[PDB]
Design a protein around this nucleic acid. Sequence first.
RNA 1: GCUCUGACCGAAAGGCGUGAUGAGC
Length: 113
Amino acid sequence: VPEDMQNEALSLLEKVRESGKVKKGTNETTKAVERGLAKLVYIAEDVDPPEIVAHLPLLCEEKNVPYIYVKSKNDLGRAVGIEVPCASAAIINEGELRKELGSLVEKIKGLQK
RNA sequence: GCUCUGACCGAAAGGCGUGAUGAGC
């Protein structure tokens, strides 16, 4: 995954919360995809463990939900407007960014073809 | 120990989304 396309996602995410709705933390993120409410899922690459966020990759591709990998969990942290680093996040409501997001959805899907 | 909740607990230092708090089992 790109670092250029990565800064984009974080941007969307940080604003997405201003209008739409976002879920922060592996626990809520997982339960989000399991309930088909995961528009997009963010995953940090710098996790401790691994065994703590490893299940997500699979669950998304099988739930037909897009997942994006990000460099630092701290970045995913300040994006979510949280104080503690976040290891994973899932946006459940695109909000007033929907369209602006749908484009990002394809850029990732067009990264695995 | 787990389930649900999901942002606070603390005088402070600090400790929490790798899960504060509060239900339950």
